[PDB]
Amino acid sequence: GIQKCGLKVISSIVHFPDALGAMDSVLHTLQMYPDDQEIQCLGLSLIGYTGHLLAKILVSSLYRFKDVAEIQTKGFQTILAILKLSASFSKLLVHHSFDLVIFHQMSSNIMEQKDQQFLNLCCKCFAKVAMDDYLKNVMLERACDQNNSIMVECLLLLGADANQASSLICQVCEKESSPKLVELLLNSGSREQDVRKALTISIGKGDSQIISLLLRRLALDVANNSICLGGFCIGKVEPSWLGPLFPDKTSNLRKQTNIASTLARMVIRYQMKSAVEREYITSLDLSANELRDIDALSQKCCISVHLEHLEKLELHQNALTSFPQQLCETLKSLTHLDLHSNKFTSFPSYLLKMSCIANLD
Amino acid sequence: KPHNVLLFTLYPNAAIIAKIADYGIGTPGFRAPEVARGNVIYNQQADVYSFGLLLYDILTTGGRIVKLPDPVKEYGCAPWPMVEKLIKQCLKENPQERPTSAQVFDILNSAELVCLTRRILLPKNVIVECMVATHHNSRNASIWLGCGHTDRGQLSFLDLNTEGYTSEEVADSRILCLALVHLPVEKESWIVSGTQSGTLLVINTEDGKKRHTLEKMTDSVTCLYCNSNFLLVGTADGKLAIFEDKTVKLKGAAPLKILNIGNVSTPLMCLSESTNSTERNVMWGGCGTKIFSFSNDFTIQKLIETRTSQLFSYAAFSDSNIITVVVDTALYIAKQNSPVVEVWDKKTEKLCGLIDCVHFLREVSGRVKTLCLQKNTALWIGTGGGHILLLDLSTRRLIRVIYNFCNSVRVMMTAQLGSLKNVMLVLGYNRKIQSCLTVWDINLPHEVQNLEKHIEVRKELAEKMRRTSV
Numbered sequence: 088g089i090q091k092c093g094l095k096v097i098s099s100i101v102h103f104p105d106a107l108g109a110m111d112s113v114l115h116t117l118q119m120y121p122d123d124q125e126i127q128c129l130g131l132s133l134i135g136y137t138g139h140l141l142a143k144i145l146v147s148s149l150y151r152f153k154d155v156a157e158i159q160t161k162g163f164q165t166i167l168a169i170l171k172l173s174a175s176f177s178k179l180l181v182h183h184s185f186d187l188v189i190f191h192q193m194s195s196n197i198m199e200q201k202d203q204q205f206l207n208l209c210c211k212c213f214a215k216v217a218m219d220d221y222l223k224n225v226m227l228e229r230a231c232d233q234n235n236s237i238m239v240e241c242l243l244l245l246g247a248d249a250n251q252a253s254s255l256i257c258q259v260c261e262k263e264s265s266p267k268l269v270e271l272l273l274n275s276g277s278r279e280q281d282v283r284k285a286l287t288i289s290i291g292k293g294d295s296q297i298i299s300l301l302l303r304r305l306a307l308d309v310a311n312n313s314i315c316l317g318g319f320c321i322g323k324v325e326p327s328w329l330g331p332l333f334p335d336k337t338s339n340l341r342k343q344t345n346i347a348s349t350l351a352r353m354v355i356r357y358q359m360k361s362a363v364e365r366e367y368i369t370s371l372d373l374s375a376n377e378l379r380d381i382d383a384l385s386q387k388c389c390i391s392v393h394l395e396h397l398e399k400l401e402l403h404q405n406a407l408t409s410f411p412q413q414l415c416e417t418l419k420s421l422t423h424l425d426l427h428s429n430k431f432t433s434f435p436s437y438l439l440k441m442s443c444i445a446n447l448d
Numbered sequence: 449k450p451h452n453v454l455l456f457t458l459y460p461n462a463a464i465i466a467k468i469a470d471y472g473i474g475t476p477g478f479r480a481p482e483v484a485r486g487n488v489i490y491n492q493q494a495d496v497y498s499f500g501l502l503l504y505d506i507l508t509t510g511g512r513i514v515k516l517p518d519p520v521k522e523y524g525c526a527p528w529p530m531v532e533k534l535i536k537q538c539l540k541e542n543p544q545e546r547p548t549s550a551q552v553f554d555i556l557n558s559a560e561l562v563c564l565t566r567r568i569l570l571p572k573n574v575i576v577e578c579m580v581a582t583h584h585n586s587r588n589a590s591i592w593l594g595c596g597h598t599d600r601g602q603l604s605f606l607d608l609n610t611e612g613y614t615s616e617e618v619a620d621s622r623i624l625c626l627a628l629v630h631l632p633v634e635k636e637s638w639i640v641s642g643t644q645s646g647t648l649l650v651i652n653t654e655d656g657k658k659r660h661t662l663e664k665m666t667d668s669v670t671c672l673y674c675n676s677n678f679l680l681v682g683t684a685d686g687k688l689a690i691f692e693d694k695t696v697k698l699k700g701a702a703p704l705k706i707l708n709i710g711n712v713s714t715p716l717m718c719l720s721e722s723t724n725s726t727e728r729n730v731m732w733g734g735c736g737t738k739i740f741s742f743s744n745d746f747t748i749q750k751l752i753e754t755r756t757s758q759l760f761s762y763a764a765f766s767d768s769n770i771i772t773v774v775v776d777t778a779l780y781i782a783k784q785n786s787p788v789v790e791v792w793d794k795k796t797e798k799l800c801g802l803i804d805c806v807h808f809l810r811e812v813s814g815r816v817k818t819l820c821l822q823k824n825t826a827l828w829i830g831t832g833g834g835h836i837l838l839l840d841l842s843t844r845r846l847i848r849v850i851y852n853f854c855n856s857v858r859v860m861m862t863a864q865l866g867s868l869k870n871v872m873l874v875l876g877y878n879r880k881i882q883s884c885l886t887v888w889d890i891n892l893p894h895e896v897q898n899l900e901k902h903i904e905v906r907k908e909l910a911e912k913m914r915r916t917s918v
């Protein structure tokens with residue numbers, strides 16, 4: 088119990104010249120008594136300058152409390168000092184728990200509070216650990232493991248290899264993830280084969296949202312006003328999947344947030360300072376998809392009013408057996424209809440009921 | 449031959465699209481002239497000529513298959529001129545003149561090859577100062593270039609669809625800037641013309657007999673703007689004349705208000721509208737060294753002073769008038785005879801950042817000339833050195849620099865053609881004086897990024913495949 092005012096007297100003595108080990112003793116105390124000594128652990132100065140357990144105790148005590156305003160600021164100050172004393176400290180930090188506390192502290196509504204100096208020192212520590220781009224890839228992978236989509240964009244803006252490794256994208260779609268994360272990943276670089284495997288995985292665990300988000304890059308050409316789902320072996324079709332692929336002019340663009348961009352910009356600044364110091368979709372290709380039946384499409388679904396403007400519907404090399412009549416009467420602008428290499432057994436007479444059929448195959 | 453190219457997909461942004469195959473089954477239609485004469489074996493130089501024939505067929509959509517003629521004349525097709533130059537280069541009779549295959553791939557790797565759509569050379573080479581487009585989406589898709597060549601003006605009219613143009617003097621003195629108004633309810637399309645003697649005139653394009661003039665300003669006409677209505681006039685004496693869109697058809701209408709925002713020592717040069725729809729009620733402009741914003745009710749909203757900019761940057765460059773303005777979430781200002789562009793915030797009315805084009809240009813006079821910005825977060829900086837700078841609004845970093853096509857960018861605007869497509873016109877100087885107009889696709893930056901990613905993916909694929917081979 089008396090160790091509290093003892094450490095207070097030590098803090099009183101830290102200002103006298105030539106204070107020199109004393110680090111080990113107070114380290115053992117802070118390891119023993121968690122709460123009150125940590126509030127006074129700011130007395131920790133540059134001592135020892137390489138025990139990984141020291142930084143481990145530091146960051147574990149930080150995240151263990153993580154809810155008293157000024158003690159986290161003091162800890163960040165001490166951390167900045169130590170990393171200024173040694174750059175190898177960075178690797179150890181990212182190794183032990185650094186991300187686990189940084190993300191939790193800056194995602195917990197860090198903005199909307201008059202903590203300008205807090206965010207400044209925090210982004211300084213960010214830019215400081217931003218070196219050693221391998222550690223940046225590690226930070227990206229760990230931020231993607233967590234469902235923390237707020238700083239994946241920040242990590243990408245600073246420059247991060249989304250193809251670092253089983254790539255990142257397949258890992259993201261393997262777990263129940265958020266659309267913003269997969270969208271930010273797909274916008275940045277991504278190997279087409281990796282995106283393909285990701286689509287296979289997401290097909291295995293049906294999720295219309297991420298499926299549409301993937302198809303919005305894999306098989307959509309806004310220029311040609313066409314969909315090019317040719318040979319993706321997608322065992323079926325769902326109108327919800329192609330839902331967000333059609334224009335839907337009622338949708339618009341709105342900047343939901345910019346905090347990630349501001350963050351990235353300010354960490355880039357701190358790093359620089361430290362270095363110095365109509366138009367419908369008129370084509371829909373579904374060839375070689377190994378389909379079995381195309382009745383999910385139409386049925387008065389969302390896609391049903393975005394098919395009346397279709398002017399070409401290729402369906403070759405699949406495995407169909409029949410063509411639903413409601414699909415025909417809905418498709419009121421088809422001109423080219425390709426059904427070759429399917430498995431049909433008798434000609435449906437009503438295929439000629441369409442308004443503008445001109446090339447039946 | 450085009451029969452020897454196998455396509456694997458029709459998706460533009462695909463990793464692999466075309467492949468080469470030799471089925472083992474030269475042909476008269478697709479043989480090199482050196483091979484046609486029977487001089488020697490094909491060697492490797494001829495293959496470039498065959499590839500040029502393939503380019504000529506792809507450009508013309510195979511029209512030749514169903515002493516080579518002009519691709520645009522013989523068959524209807526868009527210009528696409530960089531590849532026209534490439535075809536003319538690699539179809540030369542002299543086998544030494546044929547560029548090597550690596551050179552062909554290198555000059556094909558440029559995003560300028562895809563984004564540059566047209567190019568026009570004015571033969572009379574009259575020194576042009578201003579140019580405005582016509583929003584009429586009909587077949588009357590042209591530009592209304594104006595220039596000061598004699599004691600009167602030189603009123604040009606370049607027809608994009610026909611590439612022919614007519615010039616003559618109709619405004620009694622040197623002309624500076626132009627603007628167009630289209631009244632769809634009145635079916636009226638009127639262009640307002642100003643001279644340096646201090647008069648405003650209108651000239652209806654639908655009939656050259658319909659000419660009009662407005663109230664004289666004592667200084668020289670300096671600027672114009674169409675607010676979709678209120679026609680704005682920014683003169684050298686700081687006046688802000690508001691002309692009713694309707695009445696000014698007849699000769700001699702009158703301004704509804706006169707807001708003496710500035711004076712002769714700081715003339716008003718440029719105005720613009722908020723790109724964000726939430727501020728479509730406030731209009732902005734840089735009156736000399738004064739960034740003024742005002743309402744749609746002809747009432748001032750703010751008056752900012754630029755003179756504080758000397759304490760941070762160089763006072764010499766900061767002691768200049770404002771040439772171009774752009775209104776976004778952040779305000780971007782370019783000053784006369786200065787290589788820096790000033791970034792301001794519309795809320796705090798305080799300086800936020802500076803961008804030095806000198807660093808990027810020397811990385812390759814550097815004076816900024818004109819600005820155009822799009823909601824796609826891509827910024828275009830036209831430099832007096834004939835360079836175009838591409839900057840992104842998200843990170844304020846470099847994208848690409850465009851040069852070696854004109855000697856000095858004069859005016860750069862945004863417009864739309866009759867095919868509803870969005871393009872950008874870049875008027876650049878060519879002193880050996882020659883005036884060249886170039887039409888650039890509005891998807892230039894996204895195209896650069898896509899092409900970079902695509903070529904990187906292909907290089908990685910080839911490297912991995914060759915490594916697995918060894």
Ligand SMILES: Cc1ccc(C(=O)Nc2ccc(CN3CCN(C)CC3)c(C(F)(F)F)c2)cc1C#Cc1cnc2[nH]ncc2c1
Pocket residue numbers: 454468469470471472
């Ligand atoms: C089934 C098949 C066998 C062989 C080849 C072939 O080309 N081989 C081949 C031969 C020679 C050369 C290069 N020699 C080097 C010596 N020189 C003196 C001359 C050039 C090349 C290369 F140039 F590649 F190196 C490729 C293509 C196909 C095929 C196919 C196919 C695929 N897909 C299709 N879809 N529809 C139809 C269709 C057809």
